[PDB]
């Protein structure tokens, strides 16, 4: 189906412990593939997926530069932004960048991204048109005007519409076996009597790719929200994902309940009874 | 492949 490439940059200031920390992570859908740690001894972009290892030294040289240029910008920006907000000398701050693109199952371009956040909340964001910006506030407005005088959006659209998709297309083909695949969930169901008149019914889903899954509890086909506990989709660690949805029900009324499973790797949506 | 342009100050 649909595919995406996302790069995540985290720069955290740390006074006393010298210059700030910069972590860079690369993603193709729900698969991490590249990484940069400004604290690591290598001082290079390193592989984290098998198919990216293939890429030449000229590739790895380029990636190192781009990510080093960005971290060095972030160190300055961490100071500049603290000034923009008229903030206090003492404390650690965070700058978060997220960018990348979306493609179709055909490979055709869908959307480009560039979003920035200072201390957990939005700062500056590139609109879907990839021509304009959105300032979260007045400090963000300074960057907005600075970046309009620098033709940032113009240069950003060039990457996102161009090279971002060319790179996504390349990776999707090279790592075809691990990326262009959909392994369905391994569903099972458990009973836990929490009372002599009540019991917790858990609907399980193990080892599935990608992360997009939908687990719903239906009493006589009618979907429930009440007593429906839902855990956040957690990574197994081997590249697949896990998720459970449980509901507390009265004893003897187990037959009225079904768990409806929706995943890309499934030929038909699953329906399970006790 | 990571973005190389623009990498400009805020």
């Amino acid at each position, epitope marked *: 189906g649909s595919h995406s490439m996302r790069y995540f940059y985290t720069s955290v200031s740390r006074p006393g412990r010298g210059e700030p920390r910069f972590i860079a992570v690369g993603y193709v859908d729900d698969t991490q593939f590249v990484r940069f740690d400004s604290d690591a001894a290598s001082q290079r972009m390193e592989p984290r997926a098998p198919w990216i290892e293939q890429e030449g030294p000229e590739y790895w*040289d*380029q990636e190192t*530069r*781009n990510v*080093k*240029a960005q*971290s*060095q*910008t972030d*160190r*300055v920006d961490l100071g500049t932004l603290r000034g923009y907000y008229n903030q206090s000398e003492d404390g650690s701050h965070t700058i978060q960048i997220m960018y990348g693109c979306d493609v179709g199952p055909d490979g055709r371009f869908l959307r480009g991204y560039r979003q920035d956040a200072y201390d957990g909340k939005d700062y500056i964001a590139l609109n879907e048109d990839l021509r304009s910006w959105t300032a979260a506030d007045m400090a963000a407005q300074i960057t907005k005007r600075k970046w309009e005088a*620098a*033709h940032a959006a*113009e*240069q950003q659209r*060039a990457y996102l519409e*161009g*090279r971002c998709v060319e790179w996504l297309r390349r990776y999707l083909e090279n790592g075809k076996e691990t990326l262009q695949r959909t392994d369905p969930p391994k569903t099972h169901m458990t009973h836990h009597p929490i009372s002599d008149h009540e019991a917790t019914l858990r609907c399980w889903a193990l080892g599935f790719y990608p992360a997009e899954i939908t687990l719903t509890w239906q009493r006589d086909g009618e979907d429930q929200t009440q007593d429906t506990e839902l855990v956040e989709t957690r990574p197994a660690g081997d590249g697949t994902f896990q998720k459970w949805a449980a509901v507390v029900v009265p004893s003897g009324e187990e037959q009225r309940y079904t768990c409806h499973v929706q995943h890309e790797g499934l030929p038909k949506p699953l329906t399970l009874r006790w | *492949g*990571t*973005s*190389g*342009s*623009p*990498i*400009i*100050n805020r």
Partner: T-cell receptor
Amino acid sequence: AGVAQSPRYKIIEKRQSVAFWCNPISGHATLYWYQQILGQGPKLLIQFQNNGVVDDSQLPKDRFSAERLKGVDSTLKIQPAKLEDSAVYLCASSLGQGLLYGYTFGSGTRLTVLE
Amino acid sequence: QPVQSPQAVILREGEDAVINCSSSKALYSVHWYRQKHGEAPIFLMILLKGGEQKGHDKISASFNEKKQQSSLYLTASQLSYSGTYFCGLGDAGNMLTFGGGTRLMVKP
């Protein structure tokens, strides 16, 4: 304004030491050091993004050193010099990186290392 | 790494000449600089995919993606057109790798 480069010309003996100072265009985040032997195509030495180093792969680290501490002006040092070093040392500046930005070069420092 | 077509050209003022820049690896941005005497190379044009064909004074340059090449067109020379012309190659982060150079002398 323009990129400032000091000195204009420099004379150094075979194994002596020398520093080349450079001030970029005001507010420019990117700073470059190129070496131009005779009239030929300038060759990259080091690239900067404010206080830090983006690429020093082409630096003969056995003698060459470069620092831009406050992310403004920079100083390229050769310790000790060699007769192979006599060339024009060029410094350019870009607003950042840059696909639409053209470099702005300084007049360069002509160094002549002698016997 | 870029390859410059004529290393040296001696034109008679009023004549036209083309400088060609070649690349083995795909393009990003192509820069053109003119260096006179013992002085700093002055910037002429930068070309990206967004465009492609551009100008500086009476000099025009073209960028071709499929051919992985850029050419500099000098028409009706002005004798002030001397001397060296360099083409720069753009990295993903725009980091110049200069071509050989074209030492152009215009005779009046």
